[PDB]
Design an enzyme around this catalytic site. Structure first.
Site, PDB file in Angstrom:
ATOM      1  N   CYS B 106       0.832  -1.210   0.000  1.00  0.00           N
ATOM      2  CA  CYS B 106       0.000   0.000   0.000  1.00  0.00           C
ATOM      3  C   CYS B 106       0.862   1.252   0.000  1.00  0.00           C
ATOM      4  CB  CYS B 106      -0.930   0.059   1.208  1.00  0.00           C
ATOM      5  SG  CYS B 106      -1.896   1.608   1.177  1.00  0.00           S
ATOM      6  N   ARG B 109      -0.060   4.755   2.757  1.00  0.00           N
ATOM      7  CA  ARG B 109      -0.003   4.537   4.199  1.00  0.00           C
ATOM      8  C   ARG B 109       0.359   5.769   5.004  1.00  0.00           C
ATOM      9  NH1 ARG B 109       3.792  -0.490   4.814  1.00  0.00           N
ATOM     10  NH2 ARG B 109       4.381  -0.004   2.657  1.00  0.00           N
ATOM     11  N   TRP B 278      -9.125   6.033  -1.119  1.00  0.00           N
ATOM     12  CA  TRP B 278      -9.411   6.722  -2.361  1.00  0.00           C
ATOM     13  C   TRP B 278      -8.370   6.317  -3.379  1.00  0.00           C
ATOM     14  CZ3 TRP B 278      -8.584   9.839   2.057  1.00  0.00           C
ATOM     15  CH2 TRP B 278      -7.289  10.341   2.202  1.00  0.00           C
ATOM     16  N   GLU B 283      -3.974   3.640 -10.875  1.00  0.00           N
ATOM     17  CA  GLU B 283      -4.743   2.401 -10.784  1.00  0.00           C
ATOM     18  C   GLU B 283      -5.816   2.377 -11.849  1.00  0.00           C
ATOM     19  OE1 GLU B 283      -5.722   1.101  -6.558  1.00  0.00           O
ATOM     20  OE2 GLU B 283      -5.336   3.265  -6.326  1.00  0.00           O
TER      21      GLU B 283
HETATM   22  C1  HEM Z   1      -6.254   6.568   1.786  1.00  0.00           C
HETATM   23  C2  HEM Z   1      -6.003   6.443   0.480  1.00  0.00           C
HETATM   24  C3  HEM Z   1      -5.272   5.201  -0.093  1.00  0.00           C
HETATM   25  C4  HEM Z   1      -4.553   5.179  -1.211  1.00  0.00           C
HETATM   26  C5  HEM Z   1      -4.247   6.368  -2.146  1.00  0.00           C
HETATM   27  C6  HEM Z   1      -4.068   3.831  -1.402  1.00  0.00           C
HETATM   28  C7  HEM Z   1      -3.288   3.389  -2.435  1.00  0.00           C
HETATM   29  C8  HEM Z   1      -3.083   2.049  -2.700  1.00  0.00           C
HETATM   30  C9  HEM Z   1      -2.658   1.506  -3.956  1.00  0.00           C
HETATM   31  C10 HEM Z   1      -2.356   2.330  -5.234  1.00  0.00           C
HETATM   32  C11 HEM Z   1      -2.571   0.181  -3.820  1.00  0.00           C
HETATM   33  C12 HEM Z   1      -2.158  -0.801  -4.942  1.00  0.00           C
HETATM   34  C13 HEM Z   1      -3.454  -1.417  -5.470  1.00  0.00           C
HETATM   35  C14 HEM Z   1      -3.303  -2.098  -6.811  1.00  0.00           C
HETATM   36  O1  HEM Z   1      -2.261  -1.898  -7.483  1.00  0.00           O
HETATM   37  O2  HEM Z   1      -4.248  -2.839  -7.218  1.00  0.00           O
HETATM   38  C15 HEM Z   1      -2.951  -0.182  -2.470  1.00  0.00           C
HETATM   39  C16 HEM Z   1      -2.977  -1.449  -1.910  1.00  0.00           C
HETATM   40  C17 HEM Z   1      -3.378  -1.785  -0.620  1.00  0.00           C
HETATM   41  N1  HEM Z   1      -3.988  -0.933   0.273  1.00  0.00           N
HETATM   42 FE1  HEM Z   1      -3.964   1.100   0.058  1.00  0.00          FE
HETATM   43  N2  HEM Z   1      -4.537   3.052  -0.371  1.00  0.00           N
HETATM   44  C18 HEM Z   1      -5.287   3.860   0.453  1.00  0.00           C
HETATM   45  C19 HEM Z   1      -5.962   3.482   1.592  1.00  0.00           C
HETATM   46  C20 HEM Z   1      -5.928   2.254   2.184  1.00  0.00           C
HETATM   47  C21 HEM Z   1      -6.710   1.855   3.335  1.00  0.00           C
HETATM   48  C22 HEM Z   1      -7.721   2.779   4.087  1.00  0.00           C
HETATM   49  C23 HEM Z   1      -6.397   0.577   3.573  1.00  0.00           C
HETATM   50  C24 HEM Z   1      -6.855  -0.404   4.676  1.00  0.00           C
HETATM   51  C25 HEM Z   1      -7.407   0.001   5.822  1.00  0.00           C
HETATM   52  C26 HEM Z   1      -5.421   0.157   2.592  1.00  0.00           C
HETATM   53  C27 HEM Z   1      -4.860  -1.092   2.540  1.00  0.00           C
HETATM   54  C28 HEM Z   1      -4.245  -1.619   1.436  1.00  0.00           C
HETATM   55  C29 HEM Z   1      -3.767  -2.971   1.284  1.00  0.00           C
HETATM   56  C30 HEM Z   1      -3.878  -4.083   2.371  1.00  0.00           C
HETATM   57  C31 HEM Z   1      -3.245  -3.059   0.043  1.00  0.00           C
HETATM   58  C32 HEM Z   1      -2.588  -4.302  -0.597  1.00  0.00           C
HETATM   59  C33 HEM Z   1      -3.622  -5.300  -1.073  1.00  0.00           C
HETATM   60  C34 HEM Z   1      -2.827  -6.428  -1.664  1.00  0.00           C
HETATM   61  O3  HEM Z   1      -1.768  -6.774  -1.080  1.00  0.00           O
HETATM   62  O4  HEM Z   1      -3.261  -6.982  -2.700  1.00  0.00           O
HETATM   63  N3  HEM Z   1      -5.163   1.203   1.749  1.00  0.00           N
HETATM   64  N4  HEM Z   1      -3.259   0.992  -1.822  1.00  0.00           N
HETATM   65  C1  LIG Z   2      -6.612  -8.221  -2.762  1.00  0.00           C
HETATM   66  N1  LIG Z   2      -5.672  -7.283  -3.415  1.00  0.00           N
HETATM   67  C2  LIG Z   2      -6.317  -5.964  -3.491  1.00  0.00           C
HETATM   68  C3  LIG Z   2      -5.383  -4.955  -4.135  1.00  0.00           C
HETATM   69  C4  LIG Z   2      -6.182  -3.746  -4.583  1.00  0.00           C
HETATM   70  C5  LIG Z   2      -6.896  -3.776  -5.780  1.00  0.00           C
HETATM   71  C6  LIG Z   2      -7.624  -2.665  -6.192  1.00  0.00           C
HETATM   72  F1  LIG Z   2      -8.327  -2.673  -7.345  1.00  0.00           F
HETATM   73  C7  LIG Z   2      -7.617  -1.531  -5.412  1.00  0.00           C
HETATM   74  F2  LIG Z   2      -8.315  -0.451  -5.802  1.00  0.00           F
HETATM   75  C8  LIG Z   2      -6.910  -1.491  -4.228  1.00  0.00           C
HETATM   76  C9  LIG Z   2      -6.982  -0.238  -3.442  1.00  0.00           C
HETATM   77  C10 LIG Z   2      -7.478  -0.274  -2.140  1.00  0.00           C
HETATM   78  C11 LIG Z   2      -7.568   0.908  -1.416  1.00  0.00           C
HETATM   79  C12 LIG Z   2      -8.091   0.881  -0.010  1.00  0.00           C
HETATM   80  C13 LIG Z   2      -7.188   2.101  -2.015  1.00  0.00           C
HETATM   81  C14 LIG Z   2      -6.727   2.089  -3.334  1.00  0.00           C
HETATM   82  N2  LIG Z   2      -6.358   3.252  -3.940  1.00  0.00           N
HETATM   83  N3  LIG Z   2      -6.626   0.928  -4.018  1.00  0.00           N
HETATM   84  C15 LIG Z   2      -6.190  -2.595  -3.803  1.00  0.00           C
HETATM   85 CL   LIG Z   3      -9.070  -0.747  -9.136  1.00  0.00          CL
END
Ligand code: HEM
Ligand SMILES: CNCCc1cc(F)c(F)c(-c2cc(C)cc(N)n2)c1
Ligand SMILES: [Cl-]
Ligand code: HEM
Ligand SMILES: CNCCc1cc(F)c(F)c(-c2cc(C)cc(N)n2)c1
Ligand SMILES: C[C@H](O)[C@H](O)[C@H]1CNc2nc(N)[nH]c(=O)c2N1
Ligand SMILES: C[C@H](O)[C@H](O)[C@H]1CNc2nc(N)[nH]c(=O)c2N1
Ligand SMILES: [Cl-]
Ligand SMILES: [Gd+3]
Ligand SMILES: [Gd+3]
Ligand SMILES: [Zn+2]
Lengths: 400, 402
Positions: B106, B109, B278, B283
């Site tokens: 993520c 963070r 958000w 993405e």
């Molecule tokens: C607040 C704005 C946030 C932004 C801009 C953001 C951004 C991102 C992005 C760009 C990814 C990669 C997703 C992909 O490539 O498909 C990601 C993954 C992830 N996000 Fe965030 N995120 C946000 C909030 C959060 C929140 C609120 C949570 C959980 C409480 C979170 C937990 C995670 C986790 C666990 C992953 C990895 C999922 C995986 O391993 O497949 N994120 N995030």
């Molecule tokens: C099980 N692996 C999920 C990975 C994944 C796929 C996806 F399509 C998303 F959009 C986000 C994601 C989640 C959050 C909280 C914010 C953000 N910007 N992206 C994360």
């Molecule tokens: Cl998406």
């Protein structure tokens, strides 16, 4: 035990059986992955393993020739503590080391390598002659040809041959009175080493450095590359007429000169190799990295981009046009270059060839994926396994 | 010693001492790195519970307090009497935030401390699941001023099936497999689409049909729920200067809400705990719209830009991709829906890394996921060496429940 390796674009699955043959240990452990880090008579075993590899490759395993060669290397090491490669083995070894390099996206070419045998070399003057011949052959008036020159192997009781320069062609980087750099900031250290060894520095942004060549147990000697031997490409843009005025330039020949070539337990600390550039190396990394020439905002200014907000993607637009300028300019100059789409497509083909040839391919995902437009290229979607095979190119300490 | 970690842009070096606390193992060995792969007993429950309680009481500066010792003893007693235990509401909130903070893939963070935690551990049915989910979506969407939120459904417990959200996100566009092999809609969602149809959903025929939710209550077949269209905020895509771009009819939704991951806190498992934040614009603009196996619009956009698509060295793919990302950013800002570009997002992640070095002596980070899929080395994270490792609390992958 064999890693399952998936392509996420097609959904195809392979198993990397080759990784089970990995010699050296990499930096990762089950507790933590360090894959993104840039830098992390036992001879007889490695020698025998290499001879076996070679005779397997030429379909002569277990032949009289195979057993005869094994006995010869045993006799040499027993008599001399080391052994000498036959020329055929040297050529095979160099090609295999390239084939095994996990960070090289250009390995579709690995079977096409000119190997110059400079193992008879003595003195830095001879080194320079060999290096100039290499540059001449490899540059080939712009029709670049991959080449390696192999200088004498390391041996006990004698210093190594070393090229102090990280590449045969480097631009000087001059520390300014205020701590900034004129020229290539990657080359400040080698630049002042050249100056400390008697080089009269320039004052420019693209001054080709002299070579610091080290013969065994001698201080390095400065050698000036004849200017007509160093092909450069002035950078222009196909439609941005002002780009040419920025006076950007790069050189034709990427020739890495600071890595160690290891074949069959033998170590060649001087074995410069060269291919041709992938355009993102120049247009994205060398020119746009903040710690390199860092010209991105200069170009953005000239393009009248909105540099007051990141969300205009002005950085991305400017970088793309710099990469366009590199490709256009090298093509106009008739100097071999490959764009990052073609190169990654060919690397996908290489992965497929290698799966069939060897059951896998060591590949460093972070290095294979280009530094712009990563997911526009097929390698982004390809899972990869990174491991160390020998023969290999290795990092080695700077000779100071 | 600990892993030494270099930033190549600035030359700064840190040591990731936090990695020494990695509990679970990753896929790499000294023989081979698998970092690029997407998908690599009451006494162990007590050790994980004890560790988490200790984390919690450290976080509030109360280690050693009578409250700290009382909680440790209560958890030990509850596990010995019941085989499990129940988080206090404050511990759930801390644990959800830590799981986000610990998420190596993520990039967003920097926000980890601002998370709205909806406690749905009292939920009893799939209907009530839907009520919690709709309230989550309404809260998090906030008419476009998006707010990070998680809703935590009841934990896994022996004797009873899991709560599960079958959909991988709360908002997904249908992918309709056509007999010729192509897909109308989002090819990533072909399987959940067919599952929805299998469970009685009347499919649409468009490219941006919002899927129903398949919600599974314990020991129950999944139940189909239609999201009220006014609940799913969407953004029509236009480009500020490519006027024809709007005629592509492209859209995306406001709320990225991941709903298929397992939340693990103190050895407790929450198989249903959808979370949302958000979007980062890449993405949508790079992955969702330009992946060959997603909406795959790159060549049609490049042709409409009248780029020369017959040779790769004109960099038409790169140019079209940048303008598609521009269109996403412009369209989200125009619709007043929170979005962050990849430059701003990666810059803030660098601040997060710095904050975490001081707070915890490291930060688990998956380089391949952190570096954006366009303009990688134009962002500071590309030049940052990263250490990937698994800390708990955690969001984890889990098998699909079908
Ligand atoms: C607040 C704005 C946030 C932004 C801009 C953001 C951004 C991102 C992005 C760009 C990814 C990669 C997703 C992909 O490539 O498909 C990601 C993954 C992830 N996000 Fe965030 N995120 C946000 C909030 C959060 C929140 C609120 C949570 C959980 C409480 C979170 C937990 C995670 C986790 C666990 C992953 C990895 C999922 C995986 O391993 O497949 N994120 N995030
Ligand atoms: C099980 N692996 C999920 C990975 C994944 C796929 C996806 F399509 C998303 F959009 C986000 C994601 C989640 C959050 C909280 C914010 C953000 N910007 N992206 C994360
Ligand atoms: Cl998406
Ligand atoms: C023929 C065209 C070639 C192309 C297009 C190409 C492309 C590349 C690129 C883009 C890199 C990463 C460089 C960087 O990011 O700084 C690389 C690395 C590398 N190349 Fe190739 N290459 C070519 C030929 C060769 C040859 C002929 C050899 C050796 C005989 C070779 C050996 C290597 C090695 C060992 C590395 C990794 C260096 C390291 O680990 O730091 N390459 N190549
Ligand atoms: C840090 N270790 C050196 C890595 C490196 C640096 C560099 F600047 C290069 F240019 C090449 C390189 C080498 C060859 C043979 C072809 C090509 N396209 N690039 C390789
Ligand atoms: C920290 C990170 O490993 C570093 O910036 C890497 C990323 N990937 C790379 N990839 C290539 N081809 N060349 C590089 O120098 C780098 N640098
Ligand atoms: C094979 C490779 O790991 C795969 O394409 C990864 C690369 N990095 C990624 N990074 C992010 N943020 N999201 C992804 O889905 C992926 N996919
Ligand atoms: Cl270079
Ligand atoms: Gd003007
Ligand atoms: Gd117009
Ligand atoms: Zn690894």
């Amino acid at each position: 035990k064999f890693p399952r390796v998936k392509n996420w674009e097609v959904g195809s699955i392979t198993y990397d059986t080759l990784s089970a043959q990995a010699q050296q240990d990499g930096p990762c452990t089950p507790r933590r992955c360090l894959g993104s880090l840039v830098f992390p008579e036992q001879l007889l075993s490695q020698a025998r393993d290499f001879i076996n590899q070679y005779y397997s490759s030429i379909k002569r395993s277990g032949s009289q020739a195979h057993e005869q060669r094994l006995q010869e290397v045993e006799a040499e090491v027993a008599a001399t503590g080391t052994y000498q490669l036959r020329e055929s083995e040297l050529v095979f070894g160099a090609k295999q080391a390239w084939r095994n390099a996990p960070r090289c996206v250009g390995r579709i070419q690995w079977g096409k390598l000119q190997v110059f045998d400079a193992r008879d070399c003595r003195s830095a003057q001879e080194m320079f002659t060999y290096i100039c011949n290499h540059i001449k052959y490899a540059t080939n008036r712009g029709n670049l040809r991959s080449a390696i020159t192999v200088f004498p192997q390391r041996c006990p009781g004698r210093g190594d041959f070393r090229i102090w320069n990280s590449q045969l062609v480097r631009y000087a980087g001059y520390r300014q009175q205020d701590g900034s750099v004129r020229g290539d900031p990657a080359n400040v250290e080698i630049t002042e080493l050249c100056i400390q060894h008697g080089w009269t520095p320039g004052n420019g942004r693209f001054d080709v450095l002299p070579l610091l060549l080290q013969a065994p147990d001698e201080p390095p000697e400065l050698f000036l590359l004849p200017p007509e031997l160093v092909l450069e490409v002035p950078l222009e843009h196909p439609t941005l007429e002002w780009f040419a005025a920025l006076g950007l330039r790069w050189y034709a020949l990427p020739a890495v000169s600071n890595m160690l070539l290891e074949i069959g337990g033998l170590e060649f600390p001087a074995a410069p190799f060269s291919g041709w550039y992938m355009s993102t190396e120049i247009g994205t990394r060398n020119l746009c990295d903040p710690h390199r020439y860092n010209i991105l905002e200069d170009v953005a200014v000239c393009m009248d981009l909105d540099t007051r907000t990141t969300s205009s993607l002005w950085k991305d637009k400017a970088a793309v046009e710099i990469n366009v300028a590199v490709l256009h300019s090298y093509q106009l100059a008739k100097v071999t270059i490959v764009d990052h789409h073609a190169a990654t497509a060919s690397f996908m083909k290489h992965l497929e060839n290698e799966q069939k040839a060897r059951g896998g391919c060591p590949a460093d995902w972070a290095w294979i994926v280009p530094p712009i437009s990563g997911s526009l290229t097929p390698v982004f979607h390809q899972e990869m396994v990174n491991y160390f095979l020998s023969p290999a190119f290795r990092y080695q300490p700077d000779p100071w």
